[PDB]
User: Fold this.
Amino acid sequence: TDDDAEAICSMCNALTTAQIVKVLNLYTPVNEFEERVSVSFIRTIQMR
Amino acid sequence: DQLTEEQIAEFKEAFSLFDKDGDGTITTKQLGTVMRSLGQNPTEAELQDMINEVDADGNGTIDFPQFLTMMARKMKDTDSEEEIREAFRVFDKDGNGYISAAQLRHVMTNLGEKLTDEEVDEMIREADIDGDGQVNYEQFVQMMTAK
Amino acid sequence: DQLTEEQIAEFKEAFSLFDKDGDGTITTKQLGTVMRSLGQNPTEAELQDMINEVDADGNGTIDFPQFLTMMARKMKDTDSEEEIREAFRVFDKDGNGYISAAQLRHVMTNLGEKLTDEEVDEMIREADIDGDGQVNYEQFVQMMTAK
Assistant:
């Protein structure tokens, strides 16, 4: 959710934006229940 | 099936525990709550199965004899605690018998039937589980399924 | 903990006050009324437990010496106003410091032993919060103190 995006933006003080987008995009669902990050989330993080 | 008289009296007592409507017949909405409070665990999909089987009339409140019959069928097949212990030890990876509270909370919230975060938080709060330090699942399983 | 002579005399005075028979013995219902009125509050289950312990076999109607003996074996020191307060807080489903009149009447009528409606209305009236439909637990405990 976008609320998750805002909470992320709150806790991303130290890391640079490029590092943040890299780490969030390169996450992969190791197990079945979790689900892959959606492109809209990347966009929201980038513009935020 | 066979149902003892004390069991029938307890079923009557539970049949209107939250019958704030005053009808005297518990609704299917809290029916699963009734069974869970009565010591036997019905699956939510199974709970919907019973609801669909019984609510064919569309009344919304289960009849008492139907509830007793399905309860007798429930006690016909009782889940073993050792099965839950095997599942918990399977979930743990290190084999130390301790599982991270955050990991278990995440597993409960995400996989399968969603569990409200407040339910999980109350589960840790009651079971003296520590978030930072992994807590043995064996003692918690024993205390919950003391039977 | 055997009873002292002064307490025995006061107990015999209460016996006489409830000695409707007038022969120095009282019935099981009268004996339970004595027990409840004395300040100690053994549950209806507990009252039945002591009744079955005596079995009304020594004298048919319970006499004063048997009452003293059962006191000697059934001192009730568990009564405590703070225990009443914490039990009331646990009983409060809402947890907002107010126990709903509807909730308490429904519990008394159904949960545990069946309680008559007149008595329940008596408690709701004596709480003096009958109009609101939700009795404050704190003030209820403050007059529980005399109970």
Remarks:
- Helices of chain B lie at 5-15, 31-37, 44-54, 64-76, 81-91, 101-110, 117-126, 137-144.
- The longest helix of chain B spans residues 64-76.
- The CA atoms of residues 23 and 95 of chain B lie 52 Å apart.
